[PDB]
Amino acid sequence: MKYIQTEQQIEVPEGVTVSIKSRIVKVVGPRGTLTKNLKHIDVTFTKVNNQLIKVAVHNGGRKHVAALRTVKSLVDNMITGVTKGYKYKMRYVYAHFPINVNIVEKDGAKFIEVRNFLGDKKIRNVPVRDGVTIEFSTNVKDEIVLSGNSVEDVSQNAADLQQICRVRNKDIRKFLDGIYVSHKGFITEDL
Amino acid sequence: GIREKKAEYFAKLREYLEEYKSLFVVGVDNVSSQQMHEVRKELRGRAVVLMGKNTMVRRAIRGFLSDLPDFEKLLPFVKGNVGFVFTNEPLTEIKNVIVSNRVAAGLTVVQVYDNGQVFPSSILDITDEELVSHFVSAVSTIA
Amino acid sequence: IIEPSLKALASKYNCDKSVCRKCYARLPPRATNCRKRKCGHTNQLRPKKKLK
Amino acid sequence: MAHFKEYQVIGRRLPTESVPEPKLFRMRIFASNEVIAKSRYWYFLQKLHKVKKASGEIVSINQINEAHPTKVKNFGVWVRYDSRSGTHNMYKEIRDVSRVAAVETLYQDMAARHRARFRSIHILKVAEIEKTADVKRQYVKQFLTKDLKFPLPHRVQKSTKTFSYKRPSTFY
Amino acid sequence: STDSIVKASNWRLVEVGRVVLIKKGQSAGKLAAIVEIIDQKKVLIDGPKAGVPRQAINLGQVVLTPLTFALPRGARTATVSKKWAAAAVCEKWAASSWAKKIAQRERRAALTDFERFQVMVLRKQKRYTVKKALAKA
RNA sequence: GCAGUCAAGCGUUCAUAGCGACAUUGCUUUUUGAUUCUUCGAUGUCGGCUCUUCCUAUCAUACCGAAGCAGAAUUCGGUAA
RNA sequence: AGAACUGGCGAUGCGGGAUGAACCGAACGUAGAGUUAAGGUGCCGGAAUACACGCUCAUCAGACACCACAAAAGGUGUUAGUUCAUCUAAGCCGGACGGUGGCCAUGGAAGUCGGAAUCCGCUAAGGAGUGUGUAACAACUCACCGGCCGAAUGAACUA
Ligand SMILES: [Mg+2]
Ligand SMILES: [Mg+2]
Ligand SMILES: [Mg+2]
Ligand SMILES: [Mg+2]
Ligand SMILES: [Mg+2]
Ligand SMILES: [Zn+2]
Numbered sequence: 001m002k003y004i005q006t007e008q009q010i011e012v013p014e015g016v017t018v019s020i021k022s023r024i025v026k027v028v029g030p031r032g033t034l035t036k037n038l039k040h041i042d043v044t045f046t047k048v049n050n051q052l053i054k055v056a057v058h059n060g061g062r063k064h065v066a067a068l069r070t071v072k073s074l075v076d077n078m079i080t081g082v083t084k085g086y087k088y089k090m091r092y093v094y095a096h097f098p099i100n101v102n103i104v105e106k107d108g109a110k111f112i113e114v115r116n117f118l119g120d121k122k123i124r125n126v127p128v129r130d131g132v133t134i135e136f137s138t139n140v141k142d143e144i145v146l147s148g149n150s151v152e153d154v155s156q157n158a159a160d161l162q163q164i165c166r167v168r169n170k171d172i173r174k175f176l177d178g179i180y181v182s183h184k185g186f187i188t189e190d191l
Numbered sequence: 192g193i194r195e196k197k198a199e200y201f202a203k204l205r206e207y208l209e210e211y212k213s214l215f216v217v218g219v220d221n222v223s224s225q226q227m228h229e230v231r232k233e234l235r236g237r238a239v240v241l242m243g244k245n246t247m248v249r250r251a252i253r254g255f256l257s258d259l260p261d262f263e264k265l266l267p268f269v270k271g272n273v274g275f276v277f278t279n280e281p282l283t284e285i286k287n288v289i290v291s292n293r294v295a296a297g298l299t300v301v302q303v304y305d306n307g308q309v310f311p312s313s314i315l316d317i318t319d320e321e322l323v324s325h326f327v328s329a330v331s332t333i334a
Numbered sequence: 335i336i337e338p339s340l341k342a343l344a345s346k347y348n349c350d351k352s353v354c355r356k357c358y359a360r361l362p363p364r365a366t367n368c369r370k371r372k373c374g375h376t377n378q379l380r381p382k383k384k385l386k
Numbered sequence: 387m388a389h390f391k392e393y394q395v396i397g398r399r400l401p402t403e404s405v406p407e408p409k410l411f412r413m414r415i416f417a418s419n420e421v422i423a424k425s426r427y428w429y430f431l432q433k434l435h436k437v438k439k440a441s442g443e444i445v446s447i448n449q450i451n452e453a454h455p456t457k458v459k460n461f462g463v464w465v466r467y468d469s470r471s472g473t474h475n476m477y478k479e480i481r482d483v484s485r486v487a488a489v490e491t492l493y494q495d496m497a498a499r500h501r502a503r504f505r506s507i508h509i510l511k512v513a514e515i516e517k518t519a520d521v522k523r524q525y526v527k528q529f530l531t532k533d534l535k536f537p538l539p540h541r542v543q544k545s546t547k548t549f550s551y552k553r554p555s556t557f558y
Numbered sequence: 559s560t561d562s563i564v565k566a567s568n569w570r571l572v573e574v575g576r577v578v579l580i581k582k583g584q585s586a587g588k589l590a591a592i593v594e595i596i597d598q599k600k601v602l603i604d605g606p607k608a609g610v611p612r613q614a615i616n617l618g619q620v621v622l623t624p625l626t627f628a629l630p631r632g633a634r635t636a637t638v639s640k641k642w643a644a645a646a647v648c649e650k651w652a653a654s655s656w657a658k659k660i661a662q663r664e665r666r667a668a669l670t671d672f673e674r675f676q677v678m679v680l681r682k683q684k685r686y687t688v689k690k691a692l693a694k695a
Numbered sequence: 696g697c698a699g700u701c702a703a704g705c706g707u708u709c710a711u712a713g714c715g716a717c718a719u720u721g722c723u724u725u726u727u728g729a730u731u732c733u734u735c736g737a738u739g740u741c742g743g744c745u746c747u748u749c750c751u752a753u754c755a756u757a758c759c760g761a762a763g764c765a766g767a768a769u770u771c772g773g774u775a776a
Numbered sequence: 777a778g779a780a781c782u783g784g785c786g787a788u789g790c791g792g793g794a795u796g797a798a799c800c801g802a803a804c805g806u807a808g809a810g811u812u813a814a815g816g817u818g819c820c821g822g823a824a825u826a827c828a829c830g831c832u833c834a835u836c837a838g839a840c841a842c843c844a845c846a847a848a849a850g851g852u853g854u855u856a857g858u859u860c861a862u863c864u865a866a867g868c869c870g871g872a873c874g875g876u877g878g879c880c881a882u883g884g885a886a887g888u889c890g891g892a893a894u895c896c897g898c899u900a901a902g903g904a905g906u907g908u909g910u911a912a913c914a915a916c917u918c919a920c921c922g923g924c925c926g927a928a929u930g931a932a933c934u935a
Contacts, residue, residue, distance in 0.1 A: 001525040001855080002598060004536050012562060019563040042539070047564035058539055059598055062854065093340045162347075171764040173385040176336070176344035194865050201865080222900040224920040225874050231899080242871090242899045245924075250865080271923075272871085274900060295902050338907095355711070356850095358760045358772050367852060371835085372773080375851045383712070383762065456612050458594045458602055458632075469935055476857050481597055483614040491829060498830035499856050500935065519927090525856095534595055537569030538617065558569050558622065599829080616828075 006065050007056040008072040016079055018053060020045045025075060029082035031187075032149045036078060041067045081149040085187030088158045092142035094118070094177045099165070101144060101179075103134060117165050118177050124164045129157040144179065147187055155184070200243060201251040204275075207239060208259055211277040215286060215312075216265060216304035219274030227292045234289055238276040245272060261307045268302045268309070283312045351382040387493075387504045388418040390486045395427035396446040399437055410445060411435070416489045416509060420447055430508075452484040460521050460530075461488045464510035467502050475510070479523040485512055570622035572601060575629040577647060582619040585610035589623075589651060591638060594631050606639040607648065625650050 012018055016029035023038040023045075042064070046054045055075075057068050080086075092099040100115035104125075112134065114124035128134055132154050137143030144161070148154050158181050165178045185191065192198075208214070219242055231240055249269055255262055276289055282305055292298050303309045336344075350363045357373035360382070367377045393415050399408040413430055417423040424447060428439045461480045467473065478495070480488040489512060496502040515521055518530050541558040570576065576592045590605030596614060603620070604612035612635050627645035629638065651657045669677070 004528050004534075004598065017560055017562045019559065021563070021565060044539075044567055045564050046566040047562055050562050053562065053564055058537055091340055091343060093336060093344045095335050168759095170766085171385070171762095172348045173345075174765050176341060176348055178344060178347065180343050180347055182343055192865095193862075198865060217900085219900040221921065223871075223873085224901070225898095227900050228898055229874080240899065244871080246926095254865080272900085292900090293902095299900065353761065355761095356772095360760060370773095373851095375853080377851075378711090380711080383764090386765075456602060456614070458596055458614075471935075474857075474934070478856075482600075483596065483602065487614070494829045495831095495856080501831095529595055529597060533573075535571040535573035536598075537567070537571055538622070539567070539569065618828090 002059050002061055003057070003065060005056055005058055006060060006068060007054050008068050010053045010055065010072055010075050010079070012051050012053060013079065013083055016083060017050075018075070018079065020053075025078065027075070027078040027082055029079065031082045031085050034078045034082055034149055036074060038071060038074075041071060043068060043071050077151050080186070081151055084189050085147060085149060086151045086154045087145065087147040087185055087187050087191075088154050088181055089137075089183040090144040090146070090158060090161065090179050091140075091182045092144070092179050095175070097177075099142070099177070099179070101136075103128070112161050114161075114165065114179075118167060118170075118175070126157070126160045126164055129153045132157045143182075197247055197250065200241075200247055201254045204241075204251050205255055207275070207277045208255070208262065211279060213278040213280065213282060213306055214265075214304045215276035215278050215282065215289070216268060216273050216302050217276050217289070218271070218299060218301035220271040220299070220301065222295070222299045227298060230292050237285060238278050238289065241275050242272070245269075248273075264307055264309075265304060268304075273302060282310070283315055286312055349382055349384065352379045353382050354378070355380055387422070390416045390418060390490050390493075392416050392450050392486050392489070393420065393423040394446070394448045394450055395423055395444065397427060397431065397442055397444045399442050414450065416486065423447060452486060455484050458483055459514045460518070460526055461485065462511070462513045462515045463488065463492050464512070465492065465496070466508040466510055467496060467500065468506040469500065469502075477522075479515070479521060479526045481526050481529060488512065570624060571626075572617065572622065573626065574631040574633075575626045577623050577625040577627065577651075578603065578620040579623055580605075580610065580615075580620055589647070590615075590620075591627070591629060591642060591647075593629070593633055593638065604635055604638045606635050607642055612638075623651070623656070624654075 010018070013029075016027065018025065018027045020026070020038075023041070023043075024035065025038055026033065026035045043055050043057055046056070048054060055068060055071055057064050060068075092101065094117075097116050097119040099117055102113050102115075104111050104113045110128040112126040112128060114126070117124060130153070131150050132146050132148040135145040135147070137145060146154050146158050146161075162179045162181065166172075167175050167177055183191075215238075217240075219240075231238075252262065252266060252269065276286075278285075290298075290300055303312050305312060305315075352361045352363050352365055353359065354361060354368035354370060354373055354376060355378040356376050357368060357370050359368050359370050359373075361368060361379060363381070365379060367375050368379065369375070394412060395415050396410055396412045398410045399405075401408060411431065413427055415423045415426045415430075417426055424444050427444065428437075428442075431437050431442070458481065461482065463478045463480055465476045465478065467476065478492065480491055482488040482491065489509065492509070493504060493507070496507055519527075521527050521530065538558055540556045542556060543554065545554075572592060572595060574592055574594065577589055578592060580586055580588050580590060585605065585608070588605055588608035588610045590603040590608065590610045592601045593604050593612070594602040596602060599618070600614055600616055601620075602612070603610070603615050606612075625647060627641060627647055629641045633641065
């Protein structure tokens with residue numbers, strides 16, 4: 001119906017500094033620094049103090065207003081990513097052919113490389129996104145762990161790794177092999 | 192009504208304040224299906240226990256600002272879910288009879304009501320040993 | 335083979351889903367409407383069927 | 387049906403030796419000229435009393451001017467209307483400076499949202515709403531809050547000439 | 559840097575006491591004050607001093623200025639005047655480039671042909687002394 | 696000829712995996728009728744051969760979603776000419 | 777295909793409907809000036825890229841009588857409305873449970889195959905162990921669970 005103003009709030013924690021100019025947001029904390037282009041949405045930022053920045057839409061309809069919270073969130077996860085950080089964990093799941101997973105490189109590149117999936121002679125490769133760093137748990141069998149400042153980049157890189165193992169022409173309720181996201185959370189602050 | 196029903200809780204509660212002298216507020220946070228309740232008939236020659244929906248429970252309190260203001264000190268312990276033992280004496284023995292029903296791991300008390308006080312409860316008078324040797328202990332320390 | 339808990343893990347992906355009855359989309363298991371425009375966002379959904 | 391004026395129309399059945407002095411009835415009618423208003427008077431009277439204008443007469447027709455044409459009021463508007471598939475009653479609210487101003491937006495709004503032309507609507511009641519927050523409708527309540535202000539982002543100025551020697555801005 | 563920096567668009571607000579410059583109509587050219595907001599598109603204005611009649615107006619025929627003064631909402635014409643005066647609104651306006659350019663442009667337009675001629679001759683004089691300067695440092 | 700809506704029923708159980716009665720809305724113009732507008736100082740019948748192009752309501756082939764998909768085989772469905 | 781009344785076409789140009797026997801406007805000597813009709817005024821093209829309030833975003837939008845088609849049925853798209861119910865005594869996060877496998881049937885049969893009822897009741901939670909491990913112990917962990925909560929809220933509908 002057009003909402004004359006409508007706004008959301010972004011808590012800035014100690015140690016971080018968010019600066020925004022023509023909707024290009026730069027967020028900096030202990031972990032690092034992320035940036036994101038928000039030009040595709042007409043929203044207006046406003047800094048109340050260094051703990052708190054507001055975002056409004058003026059005279060906006062439903063779909064516009066829906067953009068508001070989502071901007072808040074994206075900017076929230078920038079702040080979390082650069083303080084606590086992001087960590088997604090995965091598990092290899094296979095009934096028979098063990099899924100054999102390593103890091104390999106070409107032109108100093110870095111790929112997650114997957115071998116023997118359902119007994120496949122083919123090799124699967126997934127580029128490791130910049131900023132995201134891969135580990136392998138020491139004390140959980142078949143674990144794989146992606147982490148970094150960017151939920152976006154961690155989460156997509158995990159998605160890439162699971163999508164590459166899909167199982168074609170088999171009943172996928174019986175043939176459940178894959179690499180799946182098993183937990184997702186923060187780098188710092190327990191697990 | 193449901194504001195009749197809101198009021199209803201208010202109505203009876205006030206009445207129970209005005210029907211007992213002591214009150215034990217026993218915490219009834221968590222804990223649920225069949226057990227304790229059925230012991231309480233047996234223990235209802237001493238008390239009324241009432242379980243109920245919280246915002247409602249709180250607003251009852253608001254309606255009792257009129258008098259008996261000492262129940263205000265119950266207020267910081269309204270939190271979660273608590274339940275009543277409307278009561279006369281013992282608050283440290285009878286109480287323990289009420290408490291005993293079969294533990295879970297203490298079923299389940301975590302707060303006390305003692306007429307403006309909030310004991311363990313376990314100490315209230317047993318020898319007048321805080322009134323003949325501790326109402327004159329700095330009279331003892333200095334005559 | 336495959337510990338109960340990983341079979342469960344695999345199932346959040348492979349089988350705990352619902353299905354559009356007009357267009358067949360694999361949909362979230364608690365969904366009310368199909369996300370697809372071709373079937374008119376129908377709310378005619380069914381659970382994906384469980385193995386034997 | 388245009389830029390509206392509001393009229394008192396007062397009419398009656400023609401006198402009979404049997405009933406000289408027949409009862410007088412009034413309607414407030416919104417219309418643009420008085421020929422329409424009297425038409426409208428009869429249209430409604432015929433749906434409410436046995437009378438055709440051939441058996442009646444119009445006794446008085448008088449424009450009713452807004453009393454406080456610069457106090458801002460919130461109006462409750464009651465309306466009956468026809469859709470392509472039935473007929474409906476409907477309550478809406480309008481914020482304005484005059485009934486006549488309100489009624490005109492009522493008609494534009496019935497046209498925009500429900501595709502109701504004028505022939506299809508009856509104004510049932512129109513009333514200043516006395517106490518704020520007897521106001522029921524969000525899209526008018528919004529304006530009633532204390533120290534209300536808003537910007538008007540993205541200003542487009544109309545240009546007088548076809549070419550311009552600078553890239554414009556929307557700055558307000 | 560190390561403070562969070564956020565430049566925020568500093569829009570002229572539609573608000574009671576906001577002063578506006580009327581683009582169109584008969585009160586075209588004059589200042590009035592917003593007295594009460596009607597909706598996202600209309601407001602009650604009132605320009606007692608410029609003699610623009612208190613009326614409901616569409617925001618599109620008005621242009622918001624940076625000036626605003628204290629005015630209770632709904633204020634009738636009499637107290638609008640008292641307040642506008644108390645505030646010294648015309649003073650502030652006159653002092654602006656905006657108002658000055660309007661005046662400039664108005665004065666140019668009234669120039670006689672003889673006057674246009676003198677401006678030429680004077681310009682040519684100023685020019686001259688300028689070009690020798692712009693040539694020395 | 697082809698496609699829907701409702702869902703009683705089929706489908707061990709289970710309306711809708713695959714189907715689907717009573718009814719009911721449509722679409723198509725390679726069926727057949729109905730009409731008689733054009734052509735009876737003329738528009739050369741059927742089938743085949745040859746050759747190009749177009750449609751898609753898709754038989755095969757590419758990638759998918761369903762299943763009463765364990766595997767193999769199939770079947771329903773999408774983007775596809 | 778066939779009748780009724782009127783008006784048309786045929787016998788008729790003109791202006792509009794791009795086009796077009798029959799629609800809209802208007803019927804016609806040769807011309808000048810003015811004004812209009814029906815229809816139009818982004819550009820093709822004469823005429824406001826006029827003013828005003830809304831509504832609409834279509835990976836198949838839509839765009840003007842006759843007219844150059846679309847329906848049943850659906851949509852948590854977005855708009856405005858209706859009715860019922862909650863609320864100063866929108867709405868959100870957890871409480872939805874025992875006597876009595878009660879009384880007919882029959883692994884079970886409870887509200888929970890099936891038959892007929894569903895009466896009363898009361899206000900507070902550790903599975904002889906989920907797994908590792910041992911033939912069996914030990915240790916850690918979780919089940920009628922939520923903090924609820926803050927001038928609107930829930931449901932069903934209309935177009
Ligand atoms: Mg009329
Ligand atoms: Mg009539
Ligand atoms: Mg009708
Ligand atoms: Mg009517
Ligand atoms: Mg029509
Ligand atoms: Zn679908």
